[PDB]
Amino acid sequence: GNYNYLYRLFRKSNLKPFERDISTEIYQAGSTPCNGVEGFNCYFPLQSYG
Amino acid sequence: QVTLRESGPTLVKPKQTLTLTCTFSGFSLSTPGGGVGWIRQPPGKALEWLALIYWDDDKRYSPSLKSSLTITKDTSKNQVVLTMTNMDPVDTATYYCARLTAADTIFDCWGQGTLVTVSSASTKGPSVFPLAPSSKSTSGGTAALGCLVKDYFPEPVTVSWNSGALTSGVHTFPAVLQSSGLYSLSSVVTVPSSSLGTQTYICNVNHKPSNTKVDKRVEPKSC
Amino acid sequence: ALTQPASVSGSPGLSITISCTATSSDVGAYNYVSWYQQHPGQAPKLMIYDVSKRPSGVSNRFSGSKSANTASLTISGLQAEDEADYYCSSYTTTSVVFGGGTKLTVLGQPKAAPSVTLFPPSSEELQANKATLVCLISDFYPGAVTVAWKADSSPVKAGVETTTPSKQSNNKYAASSYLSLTPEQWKSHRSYSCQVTHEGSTV
């Protein structure tokens, strides 16, 4: 598993044309915030290609 | 600013001539692009356009109802009258009085709509009877009072406690036609079992066809 | 007469698109199109009058876009206010079409247990030959569950096929029930069972 390169899957706002969006903060998924600890109803960005 | 409140009869015999009205205020029917129409919707399906009059005395009708729907205007008193014949048991719906301020905005603001049922039965009196907690009324703690009313054919009816004074937290949920042929509805206003004898509870029923403004106080009844 | 799908419901937070059909047979160019958000129990209210232009006052994130023949409402965040219907209306060649039905619910909500409370008739309708045993069933989000009667004799409807489809302020549908009884018989009967089967809490 080549886990070097990563991408972006979980987003809430479409980016603008020719815009560098380096997002690192914990994505608030599901319906309630979890503040870092993913657990349930959350997802961590920068997923792996595989 | 726009009060498209409908008024008129609610019960009609089969194969008759029905007449609906909706008094409006806050605007006029003389500005370019103005329009007042009628839109109905049977419970359980989509909506269908009936008619739409304009400011130039243009009476546009529905392609299917081309002869029954004869809508007229009255600018002197700001009232729109809708006439329809051949009352079949399919015309039961909530008729909304619409307002077309412009051509781009299709029916921006609506009214309230009245439910006109199509049947052959007459109207009946109310059955206002209080529901006080009894020895077998304690299940989980909820012992809310009620004045369930039944034995009445016209479905449109509302429950107003103290003429709209103690109506905070009312959960009066209406019902549908039963197997016998009489509607029924109760009040689920959130009142604990503690504050029941101190405050006065008079659910002023409002029957539109029968005009029965009966009142009944609610007190803790014994066995 | 254009149609539209029945359920395009999704999870809160995510974005969903109610894509109602075009049916270019009657419409000419799909110039003017409106969308309604009729709340259950009240009159329909407009949220967008043009294809993308929305009226003032009642507008948070409601937007629409028509590519070639049909538009679609785009709502992403405002998905926790009410599960109302969405009708798309457009001007036809001779009339005004209102589309079809689309019950957009909130997929995923707290599975709260239902509430069963017995309300025996007081001393007001027992002598009036109108004895009714009203049973209050509320405190459950998903639709209106079916009431079950097992009062030691037989399952009898007696006026239970109503489900009381009226949503409250807490967005919780209540399946309130009633019971048609004899003129005056209180001791000759027993406690009628109101064990309603709810999705998640069958008790």
From Swiss-Prot, chain A:
Effect of residue 38 to Q: In strain: Kappa/B.1.617.1
Region named Receptor-binding motif: 1-50
Subunit description: Binds to host ACE2. RBD also interacts with the N-linked glycan on 'Asn-90' of ACE2. Cleavage of S generates a polybasic C-terminal sequence on S1 that binds to host Neuropilin-1 (NRP1) and Neuropilin-2 (NRP2) receptors. Interacts with host integrin alpha-5/beta-1 (ITGA5:ITGB1) and with ACE2 in complex with integrin alpha-5/beta-1 (ITGA5:ITGB1). May interact via cytoplasmic c-terminus with M protein. May interact (via N-terminus) with host bilirubin and biliverdin, thereby preventing antibody binding to the SARS-CoV-2 spike NTD via an allosteric mechanism.
Source organism: Severe acute respiratory syndrome coronavirus 2 (2019-nCoV)
Domain of life: Viruses
Effect on the protein upon substituting residue 6 to R: In strain: Delta/B.1.617.2, Epsilon/B.1.427/B.1.429, Kappa/B.1.617.1, Lambda/C.37, 19B/501Y, Omicron/BA.4, Omicron/BA.5, Omicron/BQ.1.1; Contributes to cellular immunity evasion and increases infectivity
Result of changing residue 32 to K: In strain: Delta/B.1.617.2, Omicron/BA.1, Omicron/BA.2, Omicron/BA.2.12.1, Omicron/BA.2.75, Omicron/BA.4, Omicron/BA.5, Omicron/BQ.1.1, Omicron/XBB.1.5, Omicron/EG.5.1
Physiological role: Attaches the virion to the cell membrane by interacting with host receptor, initiating the infection. The major receptor is host ACE2. When S2/S2' has been cleaved, binding to the receptor triggers direct fusion at the cell membrane. When S2/S2' has not been cleaved, binding to the receptor results in internalization of the virus by endocytosis using host TFRC and GRM2 and leading to fusion of the virion membrane with the host endosomal membrane. Alternatively, may use NRP1/NRP2 and integrin as entry receptors.
Effect of substituting residue 14 to K: In strain: Omicron/BA.2.75, Omicron/BQ.1.1, Omicron/XBB.1.5, Omicron/EG.5.1
Protein name (record): Spike protein S1
Region (Disordered): 9-44
